Design a protein around this nucleic acid. Structure first.
Ligand SMILES: [Mg+2]
Ligand SMILES: [Mg+2]
Ligand SMILES: [Mg+2]
Ligand SMILES: [Mg+2]
Ligand SMILES: [Mg+2]
Ligand SMILES: [Mg+2]
Ligand SMILES: [Mg+2]
Ligand SMILES: [Mg+2]
Ligand SMILES: [Mg+2]
Ligand SMILES: [Mg+2]
Ligand SMILES: [Mg+2]
Ligand SMILES: [Mg+2]
Ligand SMILES: [Mg+2]
Ligand SMILES: [Mg+2]
Ligand SMILES: [Mg+2]
Ligand SMILES: [Mg+2]
Ligand SMILES: [Mg+2]
Ligand SMILES: [Zn+2]
Lengths: 208, 124, 138, 83, 104, 71
RNA sequence: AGCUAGUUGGUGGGGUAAUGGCCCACCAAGGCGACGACGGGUAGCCGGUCUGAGAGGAUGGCCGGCCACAGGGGCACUGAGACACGGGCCCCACUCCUACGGGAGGCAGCAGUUAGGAAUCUUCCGCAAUGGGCGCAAGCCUGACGGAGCGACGCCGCUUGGAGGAAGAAGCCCUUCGGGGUGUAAACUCCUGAACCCGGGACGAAACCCCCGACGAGGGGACUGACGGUACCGGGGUAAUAGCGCCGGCCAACUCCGUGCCAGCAGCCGCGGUAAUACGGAGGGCGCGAGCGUUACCCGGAUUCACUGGGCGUAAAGGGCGUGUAGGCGGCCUGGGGCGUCCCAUGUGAAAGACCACGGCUCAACCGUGGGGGAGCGUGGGAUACGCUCAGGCUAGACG
């Protein structure tokens, strides 16, 4: 199952900052805060010019490590965006952004992607009523994504939806902080997402 | 060739030739040791590679290499051949699976243990 | 004998243009003239006219070229960068209207010979027909 | 004897029959002469039974002999209703 | 439709039967050049009628003998050994290439 | 690791086979194919067909041995 | 490289449901072959499948279609249908019974045993559902089938937690001994709550049948589940498996120690003979993750059998030269044909799979519905530039 293990080491290896923790990842502590270098005994040594491979490999590892997903799933998702019409780079991101666990996270129900996964797993989530605990469930346009009434009293869900007061939401979303609901309006576009990723590379990496 | 020639004689499909008559094109084949000698490397290498003549159940009797720090292979010791040449030992086209049959796995292995049939070292 | 007239012509043209001849002769034949017609139309040659060389009928094929160039080798760019027989005796090539190739992403053309005359590929496609794939040119 | 019966096309614990016209001797899931309907025993969708009654009536017009169940489903879509 | 064919009667040596040499043409599947292949059919000619050299239409028929499922439907054009020639000579070359050889 | 069932017994060069190869007859019992040790070959040290020499023998194959001590 | 005597054809007859040398008598001397006969080898064929940019290559398990077989060989009987896997006879082999005369068998059906092998499952449940045979029916039979079982064998889904948490414990590794790394990782706080306990508990099953109605249409009634007390629902509820390969280059990942051309690695190039990022361990790292790696085989890379798409002066590759058979190829003009070739319509191209859409199971895997594509071939109609054909003409090739 999903990665599970020191996560900020990925943050560091990937150079770029990844928000795999929500809070703190904002506090002067995501370590990328004074330690933007890779983990291990060689972190600080000079970097030799990366190979065409390296680059593509890293770019993929990045994007994927973001949504915290098994290469298995990641790949198939990719191969799917590939067949579907439309610029693959986009389509793909749109699909990653359609995972239920992602939306729960993109809706402030959860502090991080990991956490949202657990909320989905422990059934604290709703999809047009019926609860869905499949973190890889494809949320699609029109789908309302509530929170377990039963769970609506959970401190976590409260604190989370609390700070959510004020915070805006993605233009392909919309959430009603009152009834702890939110609608998936449309598949976010490449422009809509601001991922530190060059998907042209990720495409090329699966070219090889 | 001219097109007409092609039509007449046409192209000849290439025939691949197996490099492992582990007969019945099996993935592995088990046999019995005849001799557990030692052989010297080739052209620019030196050492005493551990080898073994094997009577296969496939009927064939071939020379297999023994991978690892040290074996416990004798004579009538049943073993499993797996195919894999060894650039230094011509006439040696297969390796001997270690950890199968009479081929005890490598003792004190901590790395690529799987390729040496040695269980997980119970770390305390 | 002159094994393949249509090739013989494209080649003469190819050869002449390669050394920048202005005009160039080729033993005339209705079929040959027909092809040149397209050649002229598509603007690959200035055009052509029926002449009489040593008493026998030929076809002057007025070649065309890009302008003079800069630096080393001021030789003009070709107008006919390519031109190749496709259907050849002892290896005829026929295509269905759905199997008509698109020469050089459309920048080039292919000349088919159909029961509806010798049209180019757009002409053939438009007229919904196929035929012998005489040659591509770009 | 040509018949009108069901052909199992579902999947484990997910049966989905095909009201078919086939000679009586073929595997129940073998080559049939013609499909003429389908049936979702569990009604897992609003539409869980259709029958080209035009067609049924035809086959019956010629010796087609329906399974008791095949006849059931048929009837249930006025295949015989002669009002 | 009962397949109808055309060919030359290269053999007249039988009783109530003729050998029609049907020539076929078609593009080679991989090299595409059109190639001319062919085959002999033993057509049924009850009245002896058709003689060596004729071009006849052959018509798919009910078995008449083993190795014989065609009847001469009609004569297309009489006499023309120029075709029987090709055949005969081709056979004659055979009468060589093996241990000795055949005159050119 | 490197087991320790090696030995250092001595013997005398018998044959002068090809490619630094010898018949070396062990003072002990018989003779073995004996090849010239890398070290020794790197430091040259030609080896005549009749010298007292030291051999490294793996029980694995007594039939073979490496010449260690030059003379 | 030549094959052939029932062999090729004919006349008459037998035979079958039926055509036929299928069989027979008589007659003729034919039939096949380099466009590859005959012989040898290998092999069930296909829808498809795998790979591939494609062309193509490879393949034909599971599913559907066809064929062949039922210990090996031959033969018929009964029948609508068999030359008849759980029918018959004979011969052979093998096995078992035998009062030695003579008898009985055939799992390539389900499960299971044994043998061979690197290797392949339960002598399960059920007839409730679908389907099949017989029966007026009730119903009986159904190892077909529907299910459960075992095996990461494959595919998909899921868990081993989430959030906070030091300029950063200890231990272990490295150090230019200042320190650097494992690392927010841990400890710890708080949050959720797989397993697991309790309660409820299913679709799949409505017919056959019975009653009214005419044993019709139509209407009412009754019986019936292996799976299964499983799916799922609700309540309670524990922080609760991680491994494997790799880090010289191809190729993402580097250091210390040990060893000293040894022990060993190895796919190829190669590495090891005292500073080894290539052996062995450790720290650290890279990649995947209930998998990971190996071996085997197929496609790929390989335009390295080149149709797409390769070549032959010296790299592999021009035949010692000619004459010439078959075959391949064929100048200019015109006319007929319309074989190739092109077009249109139409039939076929089963289902499944592939593609698209929507839908069902919390998703997906899986499955249902609908739609589109599809070479090839059949039929009809059309075109005629090119190729073919036929006819006529010509002199620019050729010959004289
Ligand atoms: Mg050692
Ligand atoms: Mg076979
Ligand atoms: Mg390719
Ligand atoms: Mg009978
Ligand atoms: Mg049986
Ligand atoms: Mg039943
Ligand atoms: Mg029944
Ligand atoms: Mg690297
Ligand atoms: Mg060292
Ligand atoms: Mg190739
Ligand atoms: Mg080629
Ligand atoms: Mg080459
Ligand atoms: Mg040469
Ligand atoms: Mg020469
Ligand atoms: Mg011509
Ligand atoms: Mg035509
Ligand atoms: Mg759905
Ligand atoms: Zn971070």
């Amino acid at each position: 199952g999903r990665y599970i293990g020191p996560v900020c080491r990925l943050c560091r290896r990937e150079g770029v900052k990844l928000y795999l923790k929500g809070e703190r990842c904002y506090s002067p502590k995501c370590a990328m805060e004074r330690r933007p270098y890779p983990p291990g005994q060689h972190g600080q040594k000079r970097a030799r010019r990366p190979s065409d491979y390296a680059v593509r490999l890293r770019e993929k590892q990045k994007l994927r490590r973001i949504y915290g997903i098994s290469e298995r799933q990641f790949r198939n998702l990719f191969e799917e965006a590939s067949k579907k019409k439309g610029v693959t780079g986009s389509v793909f991101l749109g699909l990653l952004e359609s995972r239920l666990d992602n939306v729960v996270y993109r809706l402030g129900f959860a502090v991080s992607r990991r956490q949202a996964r657990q909320l989905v797993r422990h059934g604290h989530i709703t999809v047009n009523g019926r609860r869905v605990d499949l973190p890889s469930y494809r949320v699609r346009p029109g789908d309302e994504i509530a929170v377990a009434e039963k769970s609506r009293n959970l401190e976590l869900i409260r604190q989370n939806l609390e700070a959510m007061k004020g915070r805006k939401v993605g233009p392909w979303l919309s959430l009603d902080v009152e009834g702890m609901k939110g609608k998936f309006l449309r598949l976010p576009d490449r422009e809509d997402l601001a991922l530190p990723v060059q998907e042209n590379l990720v495409i090329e990496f699966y070219s090889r | 060739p001219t097109i007409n020639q092609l039509v007449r004689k046409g192209r000849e499909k290439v025939r691949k030739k197996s490099k492992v008559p582990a007969l019945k094109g099996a993935p592995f084949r088990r046999g019995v040791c005849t001799v557990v000698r030692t052989v010297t490397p080739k052209k620019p290498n030196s050492a005493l590679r551990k080898v073994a003549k094997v009577r296969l159940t496939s009927g064939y009797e071939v020379t297999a290499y023994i991978p690892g720090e040290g074996h416990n292979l004798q004579e009538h010791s049943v073993v499993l051949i797996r195919g894999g040449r060894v650039k230094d030992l011509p006439g040696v086209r297969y390796h001997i699976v270690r950890g199968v049959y009479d081929a005890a796995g490598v003792k004190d292995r901590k790395k690529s243990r799987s390729k040496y049939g040695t269980k997980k070292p119970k770390e305390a | 004998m002159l094994t393949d007239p249509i090739a013989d012509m494209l080649t003469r043209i190819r050869n002449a243009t390669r050394v920048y001849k202005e005009s160039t002769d080729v033993p005339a034949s209705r079929f040959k003239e027909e092809i040149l017609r397209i050649l002229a139309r598509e603007g690959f040659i200035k055009g052509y006219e029926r002449v009489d060389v040593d008493g026998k009928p030929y076809l002057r094929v007025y070649l065309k070229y890009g302008p003079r160039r800069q630096g080393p080798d001021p030789r003009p760019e070709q107008v006919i960068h390519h031109i190749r027989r496709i259907s050849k005796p002892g290896r005829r090539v026929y295509v269905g209207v759905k199997e008509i190739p698109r020469v050089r992403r459309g920048l080039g053309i292919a000349i088919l010979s159909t029961s509806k005359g010798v049209l180019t590929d757009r002409e053939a496609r438009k007229l919904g027909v196929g035929g012998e794939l005489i040659c591509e040119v770009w | 004897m040509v018949k009108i019966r069901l052909a199992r096309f579902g999947s484990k614990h997910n049966p989905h029959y095909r009201i078919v016209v086939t000679d009586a001797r073929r595997k129940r899931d073998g080559k049939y002469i013609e499909k003429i309907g389908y049936y979702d025993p569990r009604k897992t969708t609003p539409d869980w039974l259709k029958v080209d009654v035009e067609r049924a009536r035809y086959w019956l017009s010629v010796g087609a002999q329906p399974t008791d169940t095949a006849r059931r489903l048929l009837r249930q879509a006025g295949v015989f209703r002669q009002e | 439709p009962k397949k109808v064919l055309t060919g030359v009667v290269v053999s007249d040596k039988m009783q109530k039967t003729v050998t029609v040499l049907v020539e076929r043409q078609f593009p080679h599947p991989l090299y595409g050049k059109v190639i001319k292949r062919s085959k002999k059919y033993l057509a049924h000619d009850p009245e002896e009628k058709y003689k060596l050299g004729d071009v006849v239409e052959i018509i798919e028929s009910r078995p008449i003998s083993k190795r014989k499922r065609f009847r001469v439907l009609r004569l297309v054009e009489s006499g023309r050994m120029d075709l029987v020639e090709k055949y005969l000579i081709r056979r004659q070359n055979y009468q060589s290439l093996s241990k000795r050889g055949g005159k050119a | 690791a490197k087991e320790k069932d090696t030995i250092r017994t001595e013997g005398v060069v018998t044959e002068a086979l090809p490619n630094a190869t010898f018949r070396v007859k062990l003072d002990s019992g018989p003779e073995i194919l004996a090849y010239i040790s890398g070290k020794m070959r790197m430091h040259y040290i030609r080896i005549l067909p009749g010298d007292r020499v030291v051999v490294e023998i793996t029980p694995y194959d007594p039939t073979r041995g490496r010449i260690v001590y030059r003379k």
